[PDB]
mmCIF file of C-alpha atoms and ligand atoms in Angstrom:
data_model
loop_
_atom_site.group_PDB
_atom_site.id
_atom_site.type_symbol
_atom_site.label_atom_id
_atom_site.label_comp_id
_atom_site.label_asym_id
_atom_site.label_seq_id
_atom_site.Cartn_x
_atom_site.Cartn_y
_atom_site.Cartn_z
ATOM 1 C CA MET A 1 82.226 93.672 122.961
ATOM 2 C CA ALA A 2 84.707 96.439 123.289
ATOM 3 C CA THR A 3 86.113 99.545 125.440
ATOM 4 C CA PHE A 4 86.099 102.664 124.715
ATOM 5 C CA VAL A 5 88.440 106.019 124.146
ATOM 6 C CA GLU A 6 86.803 108.819 125.839
ATOM 7 C CA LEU A 7 86.695 112.053 123.508
ATOM 8 C CA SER A 8 86.907 115.736 124.619
ATOM 9 C CA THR A 9 83.345 116.010 124.245
ATOM 10 C CA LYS A 10 82.868 113.462 126.986
ATOM 11 C CA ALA A 11 81.661 111.004 124.314
ATOM 12 C CA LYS A 12 82.933 107.216 124.011
ATOM 13 C CA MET A 13 83.962 106.330 120.832
ATOM 14 C CA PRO A 14 84.494 102.224 120.894
ATOM 15 C CA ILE A 15 88.122 101.423 120.413
ATOM 16 C CA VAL A 16 87.970 98.805 117.851
ATOM 17 C CA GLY A 17 85.564 99.632 114.909
ATOM 18 C CA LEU A 18 84.522 98.023 111.277
ATOM 19 C CA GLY A 19 86.140 99.449 108.211
ATOM 20 C CA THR A 20 84.027 99.906 104.990
ATOM 21 C CA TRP A 21 86.579 100.926 102.311
ATOM 22 C CA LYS A 22 86.357 98.811 99.093
ATOM 23 C CA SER A 23 83.347 96.783 100.600
ATOM 24 C CA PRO A 24 81.927 95.501 97.597
ATOM 25 C CA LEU A 25 78.006 96.164 97.324
ATOM 26 C CA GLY A 26 76.557 92.959 98.096
ATOM 27 C CA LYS A 27 78.887 91.829 101.216
ATOM 28 C CA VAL A 28 79.130 95.260 103.160
ATOM 29 C CA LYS A 29 74.923 94.879 104.267
ATOM 30 C CA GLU A 30 76.319 91.310 105.681
ATOM 31 C CA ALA A 31 79.613 92.482 106.915
ATOM 32 C CA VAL A 32 77.782 95.501 108.586
ATOM 33 C CA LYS A 33 74.937 93.088 109.759
ATOM 34 C CA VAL A 34 77.887 90.534 111.180
ATOM 35 C CA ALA A 35 79.597 93.030 112.763
ATOM 36 C CA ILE A 36 77.436 94.065 115.035
ATOM 37 C CA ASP A 37 75.891 90.929 116.106
ATOM 38 C CA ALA A 38 79.867 90.335 117.324
ATOM 39 C CA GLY A 39 79.241 93.014 119.228
ATOM 40 C CA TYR A 40 80.649 96.406 117.128
ATOM 41 C CA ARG A 41 79.599 99.281 117.612
ATOM 42 C CA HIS A 42 82.019 101.554 115.480
ATOM 43 C CA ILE A 43 81.330 101.631 111.727
ATOM 44 C CA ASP A 44 83.518 103.767 109.643
ATOM 45 C CA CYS A 45 82.504 104.926 106.216
ATOM 46 C CA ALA A 46 83.224 107.551 103.520
ATOM 47 C CA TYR A 47 81.193 109.449 101.000
ATOM 48 C CA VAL A 48 83.863 108.412 98.678
ATOM 49 C CA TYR A 49 83.227 105.074 99.324
ATOM 50 C CA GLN A 50 80.191 104.960 97.592
ATOM 51 C CA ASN A 51 78.966 102.231 99.504
ATOM 52 C CA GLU A 52 77.569 103.975 102.237
ATOM 53 C CA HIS A 53 73.479 103.159 100.893
ATOM 54 C CA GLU A 54 74.247 99.748 101.473
ATOM 55 C CA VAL A 55 75.565 100.336 105.249
ATOM 56 C CA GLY A 56 72.314 102.240 105.909
ATOM 57 C CA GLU A 57 70.429 99.747 104.939
ATOM 58 C CA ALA A 58 72.208 96.887 106.954
ATOM 59 C CA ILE A 59 72.399 99.549 110.302
ATOM 60 C CA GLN A 60 68.350 100.299 109.583
ATOM 61 C CA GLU A 61 67.945 96.226 109.793
ATOM 62 C CA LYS A 62 69.947 95.623 113.032
ATOM 63 C CA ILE A 63 68.169 98.888 114.811
ATOM 64 C CA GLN A 64 64.614 97.596 113.995
ATOM 65 C CA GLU A 65 65.299 93.860 115.206
ATOM 66 C CA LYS A 66 67.038 95.658 118.541
ATOM 67 C CA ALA A 67 70.409 94.171 118.320
ATOM 68 C CA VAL A 68 71.648 97.553 119.116
ATOM 69 C CA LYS A 69 70.611 101.142 120.306
ATOM 70 C CA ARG A 70 71.278 104.507 117.965
ATOM 71 C CA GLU A 71 72.480 105.620 120.762
ATOM 72 C CA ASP A 72 75.209 102.487 121.232
ATOM 73 C CA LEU A 73 76.092 102.883 117.840
ATOM 74 C CA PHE A 74 79.150 104.590 116.508
ATOM 75 C CA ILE A 75 79.172 106.235 112.896
ATOM 76 C CA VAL A 76 81.221 108.082 111.542
ATOM 77 C CA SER A 77 82.079 109.152 107.831
ATOM 78 C CA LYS A 78 83.923 111.999 105.856
ATOM 79 C CA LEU A 79 84.081 115.069 103.495
ATOM 80 C CA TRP A 80 85.851 114.044 100.414
ATOM 81 C CA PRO A 81 87.758 117.562 99.385
ATOM 82 C CA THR A 82 86.483 117.869 96.151
ATOM 83 C CA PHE A 83 83.726 119.384 98.416
ATOM 84 C CA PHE A 84 85.374 121.999 100.209
ATOM 85 C CA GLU A 85 83.304 125.267 98.874
ATOM 86 C CA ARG A 86 81.175 125.626 101.581
ATOM 87 C CA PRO A 87 77.461 124.780 99.843
ATOM 88 C CA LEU A 88 78.874 121.698 98.549
ATOM 89 C CA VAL A 89 79.762 120.369 101.801
ATOM 90 C CA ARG A 90 76.071 120.577 102.741
ATOM 91 C CA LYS A 91 75.302 118.632 99.885
ATOM 92 C CA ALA A 92 77.982 116.173 100.026
ATOM 93 C CA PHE A 93 76.886 115.757 103.586
ATOM 94 C CA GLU A 94 72.955 115.448 103.204
ATOM 95 C CA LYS A 95 73.751 112.585 100.374
ATOM 96 C CA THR A 96 75.822 110.734 102.970
ATOM 97 C CA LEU A 97 73.495 111.585 106.160
ATOM 98 C CA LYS A 98 70.852 110.557 103.189
ATOM 99 C CA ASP A 99 72.700 107.183 102.265
ATOM 100 C CA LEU A 100 73.105 106.408 105.802
ATOM 101 C CA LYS A 101 69.530 106.584 106.413
ATOM 102 C CA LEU A 102 70.604 108.483 109.707
ATOM 103 C CA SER A 103 69.100 111.517 111.574
ATOM 104 C CA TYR A 104 72.582 112.377 113.103
ATOM 105 C CA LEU A 105 76.503 111.009 112.472
ATOM 106 C CA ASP A 106 78.587 110.751 116.020
ATOM 107 C CA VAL A 107 82.106 112.460 114.051
ATOM 108 C CA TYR A 108 82.386 113.801 110.311
ATOM 109 C CA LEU A 109 85.998 114.121 109.186
ATOM 110 C CA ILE A 110 87.911 115.934 107.081
ATOM 111 C CA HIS A 111 89.032 113.067 104.733
ATOM 112 C CA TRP A 112 92.389 114.672 103.520
ATOM 113 C CA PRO A 113 93.937 117.999 104.239
ATOM 114 C CA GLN A 114 94.207 119.379 100.149
ATOM 115 C CA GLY A 115 91.373 120.841 98.591
ATOM 116 C CA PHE A 116 90.675 119.386 95.447
ATOM 117 C CA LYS A 117 89.118 120.954 92.452
ATOM 118 C CA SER A 118 85.226 121.421 93.209
ATOM 119 C CA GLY A 119 82.612 119.282 92.044
ATOM 120 C CA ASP A 120 81.229 116.006 91.646
ATOM 121 C CA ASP A 121 84.187 114.253 89.868
ATOM 122 C CA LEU A 122 85.874 112.738 93.038
ATOM 123 C CA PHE A 123 89.862 112.197 90.982
ATOM 124 C CA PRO A 124 90.024 115.220 89.077
ATOM 125 C CA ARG A 125 93.516 114.643 87.451
ATOM 126 C CA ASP A 126 95.977 115.576 84.634
ATOM 127 C CA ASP A 127 97.226 112.856 82.178
ATOM 128 C CA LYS A 128 99.637 112.157 83.875
ATOM 129 C CA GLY A 129 97.527 111.057 86.856
ATOM 130 C CA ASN A 130 98.545 114.096 89.182
ATOM 131 C CA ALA A 131 95.554 115.402 91.436
ATOM 132 C CA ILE A 132 93.630 118.986 90.504
ATOM 133 C CA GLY A 133 93.760 121.330 93.325
ATOM 134 C CA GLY A 134 91.073 123.887 94.034
ATOM 135 C CA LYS A 135 90.964 127.119 96.501
ATOM 136 C CA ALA A 136 88.821 126.538 99.150
ATOM 137 C CA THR A 137 90.532 125.020 102.363
ATOM 138 C CA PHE A 138 90.404 122.935 104.820
ATOM 139 C CA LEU A 139 89.459 125.676 106.692
ATOM 140 C CA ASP A 140 86.716 126.962 104.725
ATOM 141 C CA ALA A 141 85.558 123.118 104.631
ATOM 142 C CA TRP A 142 85.721 123.173 108.686
ATOM 143 C CA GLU A 143 83.670 126.539 108.943
ATOM 144 C CA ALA A 144 80.888 124.878 107.249
ATOM 145 C CA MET A 145 81.190 121.306 109.369
ATOM 146 C CA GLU A 146 80.677 123.241 112.083
ATOM 147 C CA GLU A 147 77.189 124.353 111.312
ATOM 148 C CA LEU A 148 76.817 121.014 111.461
ATOM 149 C CA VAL A 149 77.339 120.288 114.555
ATOM 150 C CA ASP A 150 75.693 123.296 115.590
ATOM 151 C CA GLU A 151 72.052 122.064 114.069
ATOM 152 C CA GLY A 152 72.929 118.954 115.855
ATOM 153 C CA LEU A 153 73.789 116.873 112.519
ATOM 154 C CA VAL A 154 76.612 115.751 113.726
ATOM 155 C CA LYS A 155 77.711 115.115 117.058
ATOM 156 C CA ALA A 156 81.839 115.738 116.688
ATOM 157 C CA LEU A 157 84.438 116.519 113.572
ATOM 158 C CA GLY A 158 87.652 115.591 113.086
ATOM 159 C CA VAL A 159 90.320 115.412 110.854
ATOM 160 C CA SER A 160 91.963 112.456 108.811
ATOM 161 C CA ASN A 161 94.946 112.519 106.859
ATOM 162 C CA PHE A 162 96.731 115.194 109.236
ATOM 163 C CA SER A 163 100.186 116.338 110.339
ATOM 164 C CA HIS A 164 101.031 118.868 113.230
ATOM 165 C CA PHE A 165 101.630 121.881 111.397
ATOM 166 C CA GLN A 166 97.974 121.276 109.729
ATOM 167 C CA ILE A 167 96.140 120.019 113.573
ATOM 168 C CA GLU A 168 98.064 123.505 114.527
ATOM 169 C CA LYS A 169 97.030 125.695 111.592
ATOM 170 C CA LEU A 170 93.583 124.051 112.837
ATOM 171 C CA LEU A 171 93.707 125.011 116.102
ATOM 172 C CA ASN A 172 95.236 128.401 115.797
ATOM 173 C CA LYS A 173 92.505 129.544 113.499
ATOM 174 C CA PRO A 174 90.577 132.975 115.141
ATOM 175 C CA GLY A 175 87.199 132.079 115.449
ATOM 176 C CA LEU A 176 87.459 128.149 115.988
ATOM 177 C CA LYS A 177 84.061 127.053 117.364
ATOM 178 C CA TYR A 178 84.432 123.382 117.724
ATOM 179 C CA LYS A 179 88.057 120.961 117.727
ATOM 180 C CA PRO A 180 88.712 117.765 116.179
ATOM 181 C CA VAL A 181 88.106 115.275 118.473
ATOM 182 C CA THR A 182 90.179 112.428 116.215
ATOM 183 C CA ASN A 183 92.624 112.304 113.511
ATOM 184 C CA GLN A 184 92.307 109.165 111.577
ATOM 185 C CA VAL A 185 95.973 108.142 110.173
ATOM 186 C CA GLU A 186 97.494 104.869 108.655
ATOM 187 C CA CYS A 187 99.087 103.352 111.783
ATOM 188 C CA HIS A 188 100.689 100.190 112.756
ATOM 189 C CA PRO A 189 104.239 98.369 113.144
ATOM 190 C CA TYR A 190 106.135 99.751 110.288
ATOM 191 C CA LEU A 191 104.338 103.395 110.568
ATOM 192 C CA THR A 192 104.101 103.552 114.039
ATOM 193 C CA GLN A 193 103.271 107.475 114.183
ATOM 194 C CA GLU A 194 104.790 107.788 117.674
ATOM 195 C CA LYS A 195 105.528 111.507 117.757
ATOM 196 C CA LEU A 196 102.013 112.683 115.928
ATOM 197 C CA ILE A 197 100.359 110.736 118.310
ATOM 198 C CA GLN A 198 101.731 111.765 121.236
ATOM 199 C CA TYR A 199 101.239 115.283 119.933
ATOM 200 C CA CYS A 200 97.283 114.504 119.198
ATOM 201 C CA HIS A 201 97.027 113.153 122.844
ATOM 202 C CA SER A 202 99.154 116.508 124.470
ATOM 203 C CA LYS A 203 96.152 118.472 122.563
ATOM 204 C CA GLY A 204 92.981 116.179 123.522
ATOM 205 C CA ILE A 205 92.713 114.725 120.318
ATOM 206 C CA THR A 206 92.620 110.705 120.172
ATOM 207 C CA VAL A 207 94.087 108.956 117.132
ATOM 208 C CA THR A 208 92.034 105.936 114.985
ATOM 209 C CA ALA A 209 94.347 103.801 112.934
ATOM 210 C CA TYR A 210 93.576 102.964 109.317
ATOM 211 C CA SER A 211 94.906 100.093 107.275
ATOM 212 C CA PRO A 212 95.631 98.234 110.856
ATOM 213 C CA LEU A 213 96.558 95.045 108.836
ATOM 214 C CA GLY A 214 98.633 96.497 106.050
ATOM 215 C CA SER A 215 96.010 97.173 103.439
ATOM 216 C CA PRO A 216 96.720 93.498 101.892
ATOM 217 C CA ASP A 217 93.798 94.172 98.661
ATOM 218 C CA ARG A 218 94.732 97.689 98.131
ATOM 219 C CA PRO A 219 94.868 98.348 94.202
ATOM 220 C CA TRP A 220 98.636 99.741 93.854
ATOM 221 C CA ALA A 221 99.840 96.901 95.901
ATOM 222 C CA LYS A 222 103.247 95.976 94.661
ATOM 223 C CA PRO A 223 104.469 91.860 95.831
ATOM 224 C CA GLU A 224 108.020 94.088 96.616
ATOM 225 C CA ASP A 225 105.932 95.888 99.314
ATOM 226 C CA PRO A 226 106.000 94.967 103.339
ATOM 227 C CA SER A 227 103.355 92.425 103.896
ATOM 228 C CA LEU A 228 102.267 93.038 107.963
ATOM 229 C CA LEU A 229 100.353 89.688 108.083
ATOM 230 C CA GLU A 230 103.097 87.906 106.708
ATOM 231 C CA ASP A 231 105.890 89.341 108.861
ATOM 232 C CA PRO A 232 107.545 86.707 110.834
ATOM 233 C CA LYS A 233 108.642 89.125 113.250
ATOM 234 C CA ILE A 234 104.765 89.572 113.859
ATOM 235 C CA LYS A 235 103.467 85.897 112.981
ATOM 236 C CA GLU A 236 106.227 85.232 116.283
ATOM 237 C CA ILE A 237 103.880 86.861 118.677
ATOM 238 C CA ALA A 238 100.926 86.056 117.330
ATOM 239 C CA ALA A 239 101.978 82.219 117.857
ATOM 240 C CA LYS A 240 103.643 83.268 121.468
ATOM 241 C CA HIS A 241 99.778 83.632 122.158
ATOM 242 C CA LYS A 242 98.104 81.305 120.450
ATOM 243 C CA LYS A 243 96.370 84.150 118.297
ATOM 244 C CA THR A 244 96.403 85.421 114.849
ATOM 245 C CA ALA A 245 98.891 87.964 113.145
ATOM 246 C CA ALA A 246 95.604 90.293 112.402
ATOM 247 C CA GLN A 247 94.444 89.816 116.623
ATOM 248 C CA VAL A 248 98.094 90.930 117.338
ATOM 249 C CA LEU A 249 98.117 93.704 114.632
ATOM 250 C CA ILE A 250 95.041 95.084 116.472
ATOM 251 C CA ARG A 251 95.607 94.526 119.891
ATOM 252 C CA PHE A 252 98.910 96.324 119.506
ATOM 253 C CA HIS A 253 96.555 99.885 119.178
ATOM 254 C CA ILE A 254 94.566 99.026 122.071
ATOM 255 C CA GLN A 255 97.468 98.986 124.516
ATOM 256 C CA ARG A 256 98.192 102.227 122.693
ATOM 257 C CA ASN A 257 94.882 103.807 123.656
ATOM 258 C CA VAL A 258 94.461 104.745 119.727
ATOM 259 C CA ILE A 259 90.994 103.695 118.388
ATOM 260 C CA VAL A 260 91.707 101.011 115.207
ATOM 261 C CA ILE A 261 89.527 100.202 112.359
ATOM 262 C CA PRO A 262 90.262 97.017 110.471
ATOM 263 C CA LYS A 263 88.179 96.802 107.005
ATOM 264 C CA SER A 264 86.710 93.059 106.487
ATOM 265 C CA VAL A 265 83.606 91.612 104.135
ATOM 266 C CA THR A 266 84.485 87.829 105.748
ATOM 267 C CA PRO A 267 82.277 86.978 108.697
ATOM 268 C CA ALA A 268 85.143 84.753 110.510
ATOM 269 C CA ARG A 269 87.255 87.228 109.918
ATOM 270 C CA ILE A 270 85.463 89.924 111.110
ATOM 271 C CA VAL A 271 84.854 88.066 114.304
ATOM 272 C CA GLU A 272 88.286 87.006 114.657
ATOM 273 C CA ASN A 273 89.052 90.607 114.283
ATOM 274 C CA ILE A 274 86.882 91.775 117.546
ATOM 275 C CA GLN A 275 88.838 89.292 119.645
ATOM 276 C CA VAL A 276 91.001 90.557 121.186
ATOM 277 C CA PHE A 277 89.916 91.818 124.418
ATOM 278 C CA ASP A 278 90.927 88.039 125.793
ATOM 279 C CA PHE A 279 95.044 88.649 125.937
ATOM 280 C CA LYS A 280 97.628 90.835 126.481
ATOM 281 C CA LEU A 281 100.825 92.044 124.553
ATOM 282 C CA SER A 282 103.503 92.364 127.131
ATOM 283 C CA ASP A 283 106.045 95.544 127.422
ATOM 284 C CA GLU A 284 108.692 93.498 125.765
ATOM 285 C CA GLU A 285 106.183 92.350 122.579
ATOM 286 C CA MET A 286 104.852 95.859 122.284
ATOM 287 C CA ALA A 287 108.409 97.295 122.771
ATOM 288 C CA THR A 288 109.049 94.944 120.327
ATOM 289 C CA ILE A 289 106.247 95.878 117.563
ATOM 290 C CA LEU A 290 106.945 99.513 118.251
ATOM 291 C CA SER A 291 111.054 98.373 116.769
ATOM 292 C CA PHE A 292 109.612 97.906 113.420
ATOM 293 C CA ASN A 293 108.823 101.008 112.680
ATOM 294 C CA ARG A 294 110.448 102.143 109.312
ATOM 295 C CA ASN A 295 108.070 105.113 108.294
ATOM 296 C CA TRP A 296 106.404 103.030 105.627
ATOM 297 C CA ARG A 297 103.366 104.062 103.941
ATOM 298 C CA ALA A 298 100.657 102.141 102.022
ATOM 299 C CA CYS A 299 98.651 105.024 101.740
ATOM 300 C CA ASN A 300 100.950 107.653 100.384
ATOM 301 C CA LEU A 301 98.616 109.737 98.257
ATOM 302 C CA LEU A 302 101.967 110.665 96.300
ATOM 303 C CA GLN A 303 100.030 112.320 93.205
ATOM 304 C CA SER A 304 98.950 114.880 95.433
ATOM 305 C CA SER A 305 102.488 115.707 96.504
ATOM 306 C CA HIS A 306 102.297 118.913 94.412
ATOM 307 C CA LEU A 307 100.080 120.690 96.420
ATOM 308 C CA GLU A 308 100.369 123.037 98.983
ATOM 309 C CA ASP A 309 99.028 121.337 102.479
ATOM 310 C CA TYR A 310 100.421 118.046 101.656
ATOM 311 C CA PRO A 311 100.564 116.362 104.968
ATOM 312 C CA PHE A 312 103.628 113.716 104.432
ATOM 313 C CA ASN A 313 106.319 115.917 103.636
ATOM 314 C CA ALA A 314 106.338 117.155 107.368
ATOM 315 C CA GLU A 315 108.094 114.589 109.801
ATOM 316 C CA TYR A 316 105.087 114.008 111.846
HETATM 317 N N1 NAP B 1 90.781 108.063 106.501
HETATM 318 C C1 NAP B 1 91.767 107.637 105.003
HETATM 319 O O1 NAP B 1 92.157 108.291 104.697
HETATM 320 C C2 NAP B 1 91.241 105.933 105.085
HETATM 321 C C3 NAP B 1 91.915 105.213 103.876
HETATM 322 C C4 NAP B 1 92.251 104.008 104.328
HETATM 323 C C5 NAP B 1 91.540 103.166 104.983
HETATM 324 N N2 NAP B 1 90.712 104.088 105.786
HETATM 325 C C6 NAP B 1 89.692 103.096 106.913
HETATM 326 O O2 NAP B 1 90.676 102.469 107.559
HETATM 327 C C7 NAP B 1 89.743 101.196 107.217
HETATM 328 C C8 NAP B 1 90.478 99.883 107.573
HETATM 329 O O3 NAP B 1 92.219 100.157 106.322
HETATM 330 P P1 NAP B 1 92.058 99.438 105.184
HETATM 331 O O4 NAP B 1 91.174 98.845 104.704
HETATM 332 O O5 NAP B 1 92.757 99.821 104.316
HETATM 333 O O6 NAP B 1 93.205 97.559 105.296
HETATM 334 P P2 NAP B 1 92.781 96.793 106.346
HETATM 335 O O7 NAP B 1 92.114 97.017 107.394
HETATM 336 O O8 NAP B 1 94.428 96.895 106.994
HETATM 337 O O9 NAP B 1 93.264 95.679 105.550
HETATM 338 C C9 NAP B 1 91.908 95.015 104.801
HETATM 339 C C10 NAP B 1 92.193 93.876 104.475
HETATM 340 O O10 NAP B 1 92.654 92.972 105.107
HETATM 341 C C11 NAP B 1 91.783 91.621 105.166
HETATM 342 N N3 NAP B 1 91.498 91.383 106.185
HETATM 343 C C12 NAP B 1 90.893 92.082 107.206
HETATM 344 N N4 NAP B 1 90.942 90.691 108.877
HETATM 345 C C13 NAP B 1 91.718 89.964 108.181
HETATM 346 C C14 NAP B 1 91.919 88.617 108.525
HETATM 347 N N5 NAP B 1 91.644 88.814 109.999
HETATM 348 N N6 NAP B 1 93.193 87.762 108.528
HETATM 349 C C15 NAP B 1 93.171 88.072 107.061
HETATM 350 N N7 NAP B 1 93.277 88.864 106.771
HETATM 351 C C16 NAP B 1 92.162 89.674 107.018
HETATM 352 C C17 NAP B 1 90.818 92.038 104.134
HETATM 353 O O11 NAP B 1 90.026 90.854 103.487
HETATM 354 P P3 NAP B 1 88.515 90.973 103.402
HETATM 355 O O12 NAP B 1 87.561 91.947 103.323
HETATM 356 O O13 NAP B 1 88.215 90.232 101.798
HETATM 357 O O14 NAP B 1 88.092 89.950 104.381
HETATM 358 C C18 NAP B 1 90.766 93.188 103.136
HETATM 359 O O15 NAP B 1 91.533 92.811 102.475
HETATM 360 C C19 NAP B 1 89.428 101.087 105.634
HETATM 361 O O16 NAP B 1 88.140 100.223 105.447
HETATM 362 C C20 NAP B 1 88.447 102.447 105.717
HETATM 363 O O17 NAP B 1 87.352 102.285 106.933
HETATM 364 C C21 NAP B 1 90.772 104.822 105.769
HETATM 365 O O1 W8X B 2 90.019 106.692 102.034
HETATM 366 C C1 W8X B 2 90.543 105.588 101.806
HETATM 367 O O2 W8X B 2 89.862 104.783 102.684
HETATM 368 C C2 W8X B 2 91.249 105.248 101.153
HETATM 369 O O3 W8X B 2 91.466 106.237 99.379
HETATM 370 C C3 W8X B 2 90.803 106.097 98.449
HETATM 371 C C4 W8X B 2 89.745 105.634 98.459
HETATM 372 C C5 W8X B 2 88.839 105.352 97.550
HETATM 373 CL CL1 W8X B 2 87.182 104.701 97.592
HETATM 374 C C6 W8X B 2 89.275 105.749 96.313
HETATM 375 C C7 W8X B 2 90.321 106.441 96.261
HETATM 376 C C8 W8X B 2 91.280 106.657 97.419
HETATM 377 C C9 W8X B 2 92.647 107.619 97.513
HETATM 378 O O4 W8X B 2 92.845 108.422 98.406
HETATM 379 N N1 W8X B 2 92.636 106.921 96.523
HETATM 380 C C10 W8X B 2 94.098 107.935 95.693
HETATM 381 C C11 W8X B 2 93.785 108.647 94.862
HETATM 382 C C12 W8X B 2 93.130 109.999 95.051
HETATM 383 C C13 W8X B 2 93.016 110.931 94.674
HETATM 384 C C14 W8X B 2 93.323 111.573 93.373
HETATM 385 BR BR1 W8X B 2 92.954 112.520 91.826
HETATM 386 C C15 W8X B 2 94.019 110.219 92.750
HETATM 387 C C16 W8X B 2 94.208 109.245 93.648
#
């Protein structure tokens, strides 16, 4: 049962959530049920994961058995960048909310800052695999998303994969109604995000750490790629506390007041991953872990490098 990070809306965002990317149909429902049982309240979802309907089924069950009040649940989903044109924001969201069988989302995030070709082809690409841009921007999207908050369909808005330059563009937009309550970005010992975290915090924006375990099952994973869970320098620290590497990797974010959403459909791991409130990494250990930084991203979306608002070119 987790602590919280307070958002600028005074809302309380549970500091550990369950990730659902690539959680297969036929296992994600069980994963959500096991998670809620184990004390998880934060569930990270997305339209593009195309499993929200099963997530929704699992949440409905736990609600009616009263394992949890809806108000105790913190549900996040995200707008995919092929839906930045205004009517598409509404339709994408409605499909998300319908699949989820909920009456409101706690947070709705812009999934990526760069607009893709609009429509229902989620991965518009040229023969070489490069992403196809669209003309609607994350500003056009945000505008429409703000209406969701007005109508109470969404409690708060956020962004994901944004650089500080992007955040600035958002905050300095004349006629902005709502500010982002979080920036969800890849974060872990190899990509510690010190400057971006500093920047978001100085603006009232929390950070949500995705792929905290290095996303070891991602599709594009090459054996030469570094591997956090197998890192002897991470494993040493874990051994020092008789905890697993995953638990250290998750705890690291908690002690930075950074929200963290490890993905699993394995019951034992789902439990393990929230058992991170009965130990504490020393300052020496936190400093050692931070020193592992090498600015390596497991998620680069390099196929969209050529589009205007590519977030990862900037330093932070
Ligand atoms: N905003 C974005 O652009 C974006 C991008 C990526 C991810 N995300 C979100 O962040 C979540 C987490 O990131 P991620 O899914 O990329 O990867 P991750 O959480 O770093 O790692 C997930 C992988 O680690 C395994 N795992 C989980 N717990 C473990 C443990 N205790 N011991 C050993 N292995 C363990 C899982 O296997 P099993 O599942 O088979 O147990 C899964 O293969 C996603 O599910 C998604 O909700 C967002
Ligand atoms: O958002 C995430 O959790 C991880 O990102 C993805 C998730 C899914 Cl289910 C599918 C694709 C991605 C992703 O970002 N893929 C790389 C990509 C994206 C767009 C194009 Br066009 C080409 C490759």
